[PDB]
Every structure is written in C-alpha cells, then in structure tokens.
C-alpha cells in the first residue's frame, strides 16, 4: 500500500499481484489510507 | 494635448518624440485584417513617405 | 498585538459558521428556541442572541490554525479562540516565524476538532504556548523579532551618540529613576548607579565583585547596587524575578539565548508570560525608538565618490591597454572584474564606517531586526557587479546606489538577476517539496517503540577539538552534532565520574569536559541502536522540540524529514556565473542534497584509493591514466582520468586505504566499500551538513542520521545457495 | 491587458516546456518588451508587455525608434529599428549631455552596443540615440515615480499590483506622479472624449450635448454604475459646464479611477514612517478612521444574480410572485411579476426572483393518489426554486433586466425567461482589506484608529496612515520615501524664485521654481526630481502658521502621541503618499463550512467558495499531525469530517442532539479505490487473520 | 510649596479659532492635560448633522436625478458635510426645493424653527435648464460619528437614503507647552490649547463641553472613593 | 450612555490596583495619562532637601567612623519619608555615638515634623560613633533633581540631595478592551499605584481626582455648556 501510494503505482501493484503479497495494517501511511489510528503518538495500543 | 490638467514636471531634457497611440498594435492590425478605409489611408500615407507597409489586406 | 500567546481572534461570521451545530444545541438548551429547526432558522437570520450564544460556546474549544505550505509540525498550531469582529483572523505577532506568515495579504485556514480526544490532544500537544522550540535544531522559534527586538535593543543599548543626561547619578530605586526620566533630566540609556532591593539576583558576572564587608553578604538574596542603565533596569523587570540580572545590549542573539534559557529552565506557563511581557515592552519601546527611514538617514559615504573615481581611472587605463591591442578581451574582462570587486568592497567598508550606531537603519540591522550589510551597501554606497545574461559577470558595474539613482542601462542590466532569482525561487519551492516527499516516505514508520535498549555502543564524536595553539576549545558545531545526544557510559579522566552514563548532554557537561581536556565522547545513537522494536527513546536522545526525553510513539522519521525539508526553499546555492568551468563545479545546493540522499554518484566524481600503495601517472596522449600499485604483495589498480584533473596527489607517492586521488566529490559507494560503514555514515552526514551550514541553516545531525540509517538497512547477498 | 505579448498558448510555449532563456530578459528586449512588468507566478517571463514606443512590424517583429546621430550631431530624423538591425549599430542614451549646438559635449559618450555590451565611444563614432529615457519601460511601470530608486523585484511587484486597484467613488490623480497618467487614461477607453470641436449645450449627469462648429449636434451618453467583468462600477462624471468651448480629443467626462482625464487609482494619504504599538508590524498597516468617515477609500461593487425559467418534462417553469407555501413578508418586496423591486435592500435569504417548478413527481404513487382523492384537496407538488441572495452578500437592488421568449428577445433553446438582477453595495475600508503603493509596498489593514489616537503634527493635523520603516531598507525600495518627501513638498507649495543656487537654478530654468500649494507634480521615471532639489525645496516650503514648516530640511517632522500626548522623542518622517486599494477584498476571501455539497465519486467536501466548500487538508498537514502524534484528531478529520457517510451524518446528529461523536469507519475513498483496482482485475480482498475482514 | 492655583484665559484670533492659556501648571504637566482636552474635543462634544435624505423619484443612492450634474452618491457626499445646528431631541425634517438653472447651495434650504444651516456657500449640486430637485433632509443631533448603516431604522419608505452623520462640531485642536518666566527650581510651564471649530459653535462652547465631560469623568474617581 | 465605576483591590499596605469599569472608546487614554501625571506630580508632601554631617566636606568621599560612602548615605536619606507642616525649610537633628547602626527612629523631630519610617537604617557606625547630622526638611510636590541649591555654599557639610516630595512613588496604567453589551470598543482602565508610608493609595487617588476636577472646571467655567454625562 505504501509503495503504491508513493510512486510507480502500476509497477508496484503488478509486482504485488504476481507475488500475491499481503499488506499488514502496521505502518503510518497504510493506516491513513484505510482510515485508522496511526501507530504513533497517542494512537499506540498502549494509549488506546 | 494642450487641454490636459496642470502638472508641474521636473524633466530636464526634452523628448522629441511623443508616445504613440497605446492601442495602435491592435486597432491597426485589425484594420489590416478587414482592410477597411483606415488601413487604405495608412497604406497610401506610408507609400507617400516611402515606408514598408502590407499592401494586401488580411 | 494585544493577544496572549495561546489566543487567536477569528471573524464573527467564520466562528458562526464553524460552530453552527453547537450554537443550535445551546440555543435550544437555553430555551431561546423550542426546536432545532427554529434554532437553525434564527442562526441563518443572524439574531443577536445567536451572537451571544456563540460567545458562550466558542470558549474551551481549541481551534487549529494552519497555513498553506506546512513545512513542519509548527505550521498547524492549536489556539484558544476568542470572538472578534472584522473580516480577518487575528494572530499573535511572534508566531509568524512558525507559520512564516507575514501580513502582506497572507491567508490562514482553520479547523475545529470535534471529539473529546481530538480537542484534548489539540490543547495538550499542539497548543501554541507549548510549541516554543523548533524541532530542527532546538533553538526557540516563537521569540521576539523585527520591531520587538529593535525596541528591546533601544531599551538596553549603550549611551554612545545618544547625548545622555544625568549620567553618573545615583538612585535609590528604579521608581526614582523613572521619575528623573519623566522630568527630562535622565535618559533611559545613561550610565547611573541604581540600587536594587531584596529579592533581585545580581548579574552572574558582577557577583564576584560583591560589596566588601566583614559580614557575609547574601549576594543571592540581599539588596545591592549596580552601575547599570535605566533601560536595562526596565528590561530586567520583564524577566522573572528569580532570573539573574542582565547588563548588556540584548539585541537579537542575546535575546535568543535568554529565551532558550527561560524555556530550558522555567516551566512553560512562565516562559509564555515572559514572552508576552517581552513582546509588550518591545513594541512599547519600539514606538519611541526614533527609528524612521528618511532620505537623509540613507547616508551615501563621501568615500564612495573618490574610490569609484580612482578605480574608474584604473578601468580607463585597462580599457586603453585593451584597445591598443596588448591584451585580449578575456584579460580585459577579468582585470576589470578584479578592479571593481576591489572598489565594491572598499565602498562597502567605508559605508559601514560612515554611519553612526544611532542611525535608524544601523539600529534595525545591528539589533538583528531586519537587514544585512550588503543590502545597505546597495541602498547607500554601491550596488556593484551583477549577474549578466547567460550567467556571466558584467565587466562594468553599477557605480551608483539606489539613493543616488540607477541610470537606464544600469536598471536594464540589474533586472536580469531579479528575474532569474524569481524563477529560481518558483522552481525551488516544488523541488524542495519533492525532496521532502521522498524523505518522508523513506523515514516514515521509524517510531520510538522502546524506552531503553541496553546497548553500550555509540559514536566517538569530537567533544572539544580545535587545539590550535594547544588550547582546548569547544568545537564550532557541538550545537548540531553532540548536543542533545545522551552519553553511552560514564566518562572519567581524573579517576572520577565527570559525566554520568545516559544523561542529557547539555552545555554544562561540555564545559566540564573541555576544561578537563578530553577530545572525544561516546554518545548513544540510533545508528548504533540495537533494539528489537525499531528505535528506542534513549538512543535517539531528547526531542529537540519538547526539550524533555523523547516519548515513546514519537514519529521521529516525519520530524527528521520535515526538518531537512524546511530550509530547502531557502538554500539558494547555485553558481552565480558560469565562470568557464564545467565538471569541476559539482552540483551546489538542493541539487547537492538530492545527490547525496539518492546515493547517486556525484557529478564531479573522483576515484578513491582502494589500498595504501605507491601511486604514479601512466598518462597516454590518447587517454590519461593514474595507476596505483599497492605494497604488501597486492594487485595493481588504475583509474582513467581526464586531462583537466588538477591532481591533489603527486606521482610515486604513498597513498592510504581511504584517500582521494583527484579533486572532486567522492562516491558514497566507495566510502562504504573500501573504508566501512561508520565511514560512509560520517561522510554523508558531513557532506550534507557542509552545504546546510555553509548557508547558515542549522539542523541537528540526528535528523540526517535517521535517513542515513534507513539508507543502509539492506545488504546485497552473494554465495547464497547454502 | 491590450499590450501584452503572450507566449503561453496555441502554437507557442507551455508552462513546463519553457526553460530559462525564454523566461529571462534579453539585451534585445530593450525598447520592445518590458523587463519589469511580468506575472509573479508560473508565468514569469512568458507573459510580458509591449514597451511604450514599440511598433509591430509587418512581419511581426517589434521596432523601437532611434534618433539618427549624423556625424555626431543629433537630429530629429527618427528611424524605427528592430533587434537585428539594432545589433549592427552603436546606440547612445537619451540623457547623454548635449549642448546648444546638437554636437556632443563630452568626449566619452556611453553607448549600448551589439550583444548587450555597453562601451563608450568618441561620439562622432556614435550612430543612433534613444529617443526617450523611458523607452525601455512599459506603461504601468512608467506610472511609478522614482523607479530608479527601487530594486527591480519591488518595481515588478508594484507594477503588477497597481492593476488590482479598485476604482473609488471620488478619484484624485496622484499628488506626485509621472507625466503619464493623462496619456494612459486618454489612450484607454473609459474617458469620454470629444469627437469634434464645438460648445457644450446640456450637461446632466447622464449625458453631454454639444453643438459642433460644423453645424451638427452630438449627445454623449455616459455610463452610470454599470457592472464590470470583475464586479466594480464604471460610473462616469462630467468635467465641463454648459458653456465650454470644446476641441476634438478633449475629455468631457472621466471614467472610473480618473480625475480630469488623468488616471487616479488611489488616494493621497498623509503617512508617518514609524512603528506603532505593534500594529504595523511585519508589513501590516494602520490608518485613521478619517478615511472611513470621509469615504476616501470607499468603493461600489455590483453583483448580478441571473436566473432562468426552464421547461421540464412535467411542464413549464414560470416566474410567479405567488411562491408555494411561504410567509407574506418574504415576498412582500416582490413585484407583481415576481421579481424584486428596484431600490430594495437585500440580505442573505432574500428572494431576488420568485420562480416555481411546474410540479414535482415526489409523491404521486397510487397510495398518495388515493390519499389525495379522499382528502379532496390536491396538494400542490411544486418545487420552490426561487432565486435567493447567496449567503454572505448584501446591497441595494440597482437594476433588473428581463429577457423573454414571447417577446423578440432571443434566448437559448429551453429557457423561457431570463432575469438578471444587479445588486449594488458600498464597501468602506475595514480591517482586512489590502492597500499598496507604486513601489511594491503592500500590506493588509490591521487597525483603524480613532482620529485622536493617531499621531499629529504641530498645528494639529493627524496623519492618515502609519507605515513601518523596517520594510523600506530591508525590502530595498527607497523610492517611497522620495515619493513621500515630494508629496509633502507639493502639498505645501514652494517659492524658490531667484536664489542663485544650483538646485534652484535648475528648477527655475525648467519652470518649477514657484508652485502653489496643492499643485500636482510630475516625476518622469528617469528624468525626475533630484534628491538635492527635494532637500533644498523642503527648506523653502510655503509656511502655514507664521513661519511654521512642520517638516525640517531633514525630511522629518516633530509629532505628538495621540494616546498620551507626549511629543515623540525624535522627529518622524512624514508626507503624502499615493495609496491604492487593491481588488483583493476581505469579504470574498472569508470562506467557512460546517456541512455542505459533497462530491460524486468520492464522498468528500467540494472545493470553491461559492460551493460553500471545504479546506484541502493536504498530505503535508497529515505529516504535521503525525509528527505531533495527534492520532485521534487525524482520524476524526480524515473520516468524520470527510468521506464517511454514516460518520458524517451521525456526528452532526450527535452534536445537534448532544452526544458523543461516534467512532470512525471505513472511508468511501478506500471503497472506490478497491473497486477501481478490482476493475483492473486485481483480487483485492480486505482479509482478516481469521478470514475476510469486514468491508 | 507654590500656592498658585491654575488660571484659564482666552485669546481670540478668528471668529471660530481661539487659544486658551493655562499658566500655573507643574513642569511636565501641560502635554497630558492639553492632549486630554484635544482628545475629548475631537471625540465627544455634541453637534448635529443630516441623518438621512429622500429625493423625489429616487429609490436608492446608485441612480441619477434628471437635470442634475451630480449623482445621488455625489449629492450625499456633499450633504454629509453640512454644518447644521439643531435644538430638538427628536428628528426634524428639513426641505430643499429648487427649479431651473442654478447652483443649488445650502442657503436654498428651508430649515424649520429651531434648526440652522451655518454654511450657506456650500454648493450641493448644479441644475440644468430642465432640472428640478426636491429633497427631504432629516437633521438629528448626536456626538462623534455614526455610519449610514446605523442610521437605518425604517423600510416602509422605499425612497429614503440613510447617510453618514459627522456630528462633531470641532474641526482641529492642537496645543503647546512653553516655559513660564517665573524663576523657580521646578520651572513651571504654560499650556496653550488652540481650538478651531466648525461654524455650529464657538471654540468657547466646545471647550466648555470638553471641560464638563472631563470634570464629570474625574469626579467619578474623586467622589466615589471614601 | 454607560456609568463607569471605580473599584479598588488592595494587594498590600503600600500599593493598590484601581479599575475604571466600562467607559467610551478613547476615554481610557484620556483618563490614564492624566491620572498618572496628577497622582505623581501634584500631591504635596515633604522631603529632605539637604543634609549636613558633622565634620564633612562635599568632595571628601566617605565619612570617618561611618562605613557607608557619602553616596550611600545620600541614598538612604532620600529614601526617608518625612511630613512637614511648617511650610519652611525646617532643620531636623540626629545624634549618635558608639558603634552599631543608626536608624531613623533616633531622629530628633521638632514639633510638627515627623518621620514615618523609623526602622530605616541611615548608616552603620564602626568604633566611635560621633555621627551628628542636621538635615533640611522642606515641602513641595513632584521630583526635583539636586541642582545646585547653594546648600554647600552656605556651609560645606550641607549638601543637596534629590527630593521625592511626591507621596506616590510609582504608578502604571494600561487600557484594555471590555465586552459591554455586544460592543467591543469600550475600554477599562487599570492603574496600579505604589506609595510610600505617608498615605494610603485611595487617599492619593482622591487627591488626584480633586486636582483634575479643578483643573478642568477651569475649562468648564468658560461657559455653562452641556456635553452630557451618565
Ligand atoms: Mg506574504
Ligand atoms: Zn537504543
């Protein structure tokens, strides 16, 4: 998700489809795409 | 012209040429396009003074 | 200018629109309406009770102000909203550097957090009172500036050229001093002996000259007397009572030091109060400073005439010797550029000499309010040589300041550089934006997840180098490099612990260690951090923005990217003129920063010796070459080099494992290959800081180290079948 | 706008394709394209402006005039040369010293030679000379007095922003200006001129009737409060009385921003350069409340609200006064034909034009048909589409125009009636507006002081505006101080006849030695007033009370503190400067939103002010909130404040009723993203660790 | 120490210009008091002005009246600078009527009983040979300045045009502080407040009103405490 | 229109805060500076105009038997508060012997003169005291710098000192806007005034009010006009 968001969306998504590689929610960018509390600041599970 | 309001000028040298019409670039060109009477007058006037002019309207 | 640091005045219609649903709820609850739809109708009608209810409701609802280009976290800040008339948003005068917002038609956007958590975070984390220190270097950003500093400088300046009155008199208090000032028989800046009562803390410098007496005088907490000036006695009433007295011109840099000390020593509320008091005093005394630009206050030095005439005569001689045919046109040019550079610098120094220090422009420049000395040179003495078309240097300069009046051709020549600079800025905005985007995408998700990894490794940073004449002096860049970085382990030089382990490395430790003679220090760092979960707080150090220890969950990567991206627009490093040079001139400025950060091979690449050896030249007319054969029974190596190489290593000489051969920019790949990993880290950090601190921009080395750590996280594998 | 030389367009360059050498002034631009006037954005160097003396050749090249310097003696024989024929000649300067005989005086005559190479020559060698020392400059930049005392950056900014000046109710030409307002206004088209000689006959405000000397009559009809493309007014005012002998070309009425046929884009204000309690800090501006009372910087702005009556499938739309189900007061101010009455004052929500849809297929299902049949009252199903004032606007209805299909008025296919209502408003200068001068010295308005609070001179006159002196040297435009000094000098006229001093000698040989108070002065952009003359004249400024000359030869005057009364410690620099009111108006910029029009594909707030749009919270701001660690705020404003239909509805419901804001959900942008890349044939399934995670 | 109580005089230089001298003042005390007088004079001394107008056959201010060389907006610019003194608490209407050619000035106005126009040379418009003007000027007395927006209170008369009322009757006030010749260790000072006023009042009445205002304001502080 | 009112808050016995509640725009800056200058430079009181220490000279720096320099003695004395009802340059005596400290409690006031701060320390005596000093109290108002008063000329020991006749030592004013019935240009005035031990702050405020009321009744009596009030 983060790599597709940054650059080379076609190449990144094609490689991800070939590899059948899944994305885990962990990350900042890829957690603002889905619209979730970022894993930083006060959004950490400790503070949640 | 001579009827302009009063304004006191500090110019120390005299320009022998006054600024031409500030819209000649458009009106003259479009007169050449339509080739109307103003453009013909301009053409004959330029020919009398031996200038370079477009003799064929747009 | 009447706002507190945590206050914003927002227009009436804007506040009405943003807070609509709350206004309807309050109107219904206060029985001003029987139903929500009627409340909506009346709110649309703009009744008076609606306005009173808006005043009631905006309280205790923090409001996030923002400017369009958000170059760092102090570009969106939370304020407490107060309801104001007009059609414009009222903002504090000294938060204009955090936003970069000058009042020339700039605009501000504004947002309203809704949830309890959202506004709680707004007030606790984002409030303008808390955000006083920049994250890039730790220097305070919300501090007085421009007219405010010109006012405190007038307050605490000397009496030179200020025709003092009542100098040498003695006063039993400052109240008596202001009585004399009102009477017209004392000046705010006249040397006078003032008595200060119990509670006043004397100057740190003046204490050892305490009053002689058999009894032990409580210099900390006793009445004392000081040969001060009235303005300084007034200035020291703005600072908190416990603060030591200040007895010097607080122009711009000393005010920055005082604000930094206040922030690092006193709690945030008192620091904000002190900032407000300093703001009020600075404005108040800036009004009466007497700084008013007039055509006479721009003083053209009488030196300029004769200097420019004599150098003009020399130019005439050079032109005559060109037209006679002895020299070429290029020689004539270079000679005239040298002549007129001499003339320009001579006129600049004469202009600096001429004006008094009580001049308006001199006051605002020397106070560090607004201005430089080149600007004054152009305005008063001389404009000088300018970038000709196609990035060249006009031989003939502009021999006239703006006060004297540029000629026609002088103005036509001068507009070249203006246009070029405007276009350069327009492009560099987007260039820096792209650079910051890449830095953020790389460094994002490097988050402090660990309180403390139990490492004992660190960097061997020079603590007090520069032993020029055998004198231990604090290094010139401890502020960026070694400051804020904690200590790996206890440092002992005399058999006792000078600095305990893992403690914040502030200036007091620096003075201790430089006095005791050390020349290095072992600091914990992210580069040497070994933690299971990403980075740890202790190795990173202290957050340059909050001052305290880095809190777990800090998005340090985004902070580092923003810190490196902020000054990107203002670098402005590129060749003024072509100078008939290519290749030798490596890329300068933001191009250089992208070159280092992308790992792209430098444009002016120069090979670096693989091993210590004997190096000689095997130059061939078809192709020049430099060949080094190493000792210790090693294989020889060679480098193809251009004819124009300006070699910095002689033939048949002894090179070492990690030395350059020709003048240029070493590849980071080489420094990683032949030297090692600490070497490439050091080289990259130093090379980026080179341009950054050549401009004067100051970024802590941690923010670069984050990117460098991300750049070296992967290894290319070989012999991998097993 | 009519002298531009555009480059970005069809058959030419583009924004990104253009490099540098096109965006940079060339040595051949001298006299043909303006170095200084240029956009301050992406279009730098692309969009330009013809010089004052430029002439487009038949082939399309620009030509500039040059006096033929024949064997070193100047002549009036002007030849127009283009850049290519210009690069074969040696060109002197118009300001080169010259004697009574036209032969050159000094041996060294500076010349602009081929390749942009200035290099002096003997003089007989010289072959051409510039016809004017402002040949290089354009018209707008020629407005600026003391241009040579400004860096090109601020001259460029000033020329750019002089074009945004709003026209004011009463317009006065600048007290200190160039010799260029008259010709600039006359050669434009807003100044009513005389076609032929004659005598004026009837002079109302609306028309001027003149009896020609050839035996004919002409009645010039004058425009009165006519809206412009940008919403200003084109009111015209007469200059002649009903006995005046006219000549062809003479000005009979003046257009907006003109006085006696001379441009007047702003007003002369009395300014003192000083800091003032941190209100003109960082380029802000302080001005007295006099300018609000006197309406010195006021303007009239007109807004049109056009509405059309259509013919839908269910019938025709009609402009009917009897709007369905409304109170009597809302349409009490509506004509019998449904349109608002001229002269009425309007506020947000006022029905400018009443219109009704023929009917709405809202509830006519068999159930509703049975209900209506049993009721016996066929409830009207018409939609109230009445034109209303956009929220945030006020004014008086200055006009109404109605086009119709039944009459001969043409209309586009589909519309039966077209009603265009013009609503006019008067804008007084308030805190938020933007003033500027002719030197790029612009700033917003921060405070309006009571007339007593403002500093005042010795005899009591307050100053009008307060400007920070910090900007002048740092921004490096020390021409506004010269303008200020000459403005004060002109307001308090001088009498320097017969002093036998150099500056006085020059001023009396020119003919400016004696000048009555209030006279307007001309400062040619490269032949203007000298600094020495300004200083000398300042010593001989006609006094007011006895010999009172508030301003000393230092250019400075002693002021008093209007809030305490004590004299200020040192003299201040005061004088008259021309301040322009720019079209950047605070009223338009104020943009606010709570809820409103979302977009179609992405369920996000729309942009633009007229749409009541939202504010683009770019990704840089997301970085800022992430750096702060503000987790819940970012989640709330990425989902609840945008792109979460259920969240958007429920947050509003909770606030109006009073309740906790609900937990966010899945953005609709994510849903459309996954559907899009599914249509790209990627099996993008939101998976849980135990299966398929909730969409 | 010095028992000289302050004393006030009046010099007269023109019919509406007067210098008022206060000699027995402490040093460094003339400026503050003179500026308090200047502030109160320029701020809060009552006068009167035209609150509104109404021309025949005119519904708004953005139109023209036939035969008149000036627009209604220019007419209002001329009306707002009318120096008129009233004596009625309630508004009193004031009519102007003119026909045929002629510069309609302020002298042509027909003020009611208890109202006066103190500038008869004010040129209000210039009619044509076929121009007629019929105006209904409402005069009201207040202090300071009130905008046309605040003067707006009724709408049933579609034809009225509320205008801005410059109530202030004083024109410009300055002052000075000189040195009293008295030989003293403190060198007392002499205040010279120079008042010029519009024709509605003499400077003496403006000074009296300013003094009354200030006396009341400071008697608040004096009497209220103990 | 609105009736401004005066309220006072007492922080201690030496200074107090005075708040002037809603007034019209710009009236805050009419009341503020005038009240400040009147409170400061109009109220009458007594101060020590000169001092003669036994066997001393004006140029002679210190005093034998006294550790404090002459300048320190001058400061300690011009800090002294005294109230003189005699309307003449009375002279007050202070006699001290032996070592110790000499306070203002040991002054010898004539009938009518009084020193209100008895615990002020004038000097410290080492060894033999022999401190006999006569100081010339005087009456006045304001602040007079120690211009040559011919006090050294009459007798060398008698030296001139700066005189703080004014009971109020310092006072500062500030004008801050207040929200008063939908209007936001109404001002309120804050005056913080400190005063020596002579009189309370409220008494000084009342005296300044009296002085200003008379000073502007002067102008009010030019004619019985009626600007209006409350
Ligand atoms: Mg700006
Ligand atoms: Zn670690």
UniProtKB/Swiss-Prot annotation, chain A:
Organism's domain of life? Answer: Bacteria
Describe the family membership recorded for this protein in Swiss-Prot or TrEMBL: Belongs to the RNA polymerase beta' chain family.
Its assembly, as annotated, is: The RNAP catalytic core consists of 2 alpha, 1 beta, 1 beta' and 1 omega subunit. When a sigma factor is associated with the core the holoenzyme is formed, which can initiate transcription.
Protein's job: DNA-dependent RNA polymerase catalyzes the transcription of DNA into RNA using the four ribonucleoside triphosphates as substrates.
Know the name of this protein?
Answer: DNA-directed RNA polymerase subunit beta'
Species for this entry: Streptomyces coelicolor (strain ATCC BAA-471 / A3(2) / M145)
Point out the gene that encodes the protein.
Answer: rpoC
Parent-protein start and end of this portion: 1204 to 1251 of 1299
Swiss-Prot record, chain B:
Q: Which gene is the coding source of this polypeptide chain?
A: rpoB
Q: Origin organism of this chain?
A: Streptomyces coelicolor (strain ATCC BAA-471 / A3(2) / M145)
Q: What does this protein do?
A: DNA-dependent RNA polymerase catalyzes the transcription of DNA into RNA using the four ribonucleoside triphosphates as substrates.
**Full protein stretch here:** 16 to 73 of 1161
Name this polypeptide is given: DNA-directed RNA polymerase subunit beta
How would you summarize the oligomeric state and partners of this protein? The RNAP catalytic core consists of 2 alpha, 1 beta, 1 beta' and 1 omega subunit. When a sigma factor is associated with the core the holoenzyme is formed, which can initiate transcription. The RNAP complex including the principal sigma factor HrdB also interacts with RNA-binding protein RbpA.
Q: What family, per the record?
A: Belongs to the RNA polymerase beta chain family.
Swiss-Prot record, chain D:
Instruction: Name the EC number(s).
Output: 2.7.7.6
Q: Does the keyword Nucleotidyltransferase apply?
A: yes
Which GO MF terms does the UniProt record name? DNA binding; DNA-directed RNA polymerase activity; ribonucleoside binding
> GO biological process: what's one of them?
DNA-templated transcription
| GO cellular component term, pick one | DNA-directed RNA polymerase complex
UniProt keyword annotation of Ligase present: no
Coiled coil (UniProt feature): none
Q: Which UniProt keywords apply?
A: DNA-directed RNA polymerase, Nucleotidyltransferase, Transcription, Transferase
Enzyme superclass (EC): transferase
Q: Which domain of life is it from?
A: Bacteria
Reaction(s) catalysed by this chain, per the record, are: RNA(n) + a ribonucleoside 5'-triphosphate = RNA(n+1) + diphosphate
| Cited function | DNA-dependent RNA polymerase catalyzes the transcription of DNA into RNA using the four ribonucleoside triphosphates as substrates.
Membership in a protein family: Belongs to the RNA polymerase beta chain family.
Q: How does it assemble?
A: The RNAP catalytic core consists of 2 alpha, 1 beta, 1 beta' and 1 omega subunit. When a sigma factor is associated with the core the holoenzyme is formed, which can initiate transcription. The RNAP complex including the principal sigma factor HrdB also interacts with RNA-binding protein RbpA.
Q: What name does this protein carry?
A: DNA-directed RNA polymerase subunit beta
* Annotated organism of origin: Streptomyces coelicolor (strain ATCC BAA-471 / A3(2) / M145)
Q: Which residues of the parent protein does this chain contain? A: 437 to 1131 of 1161
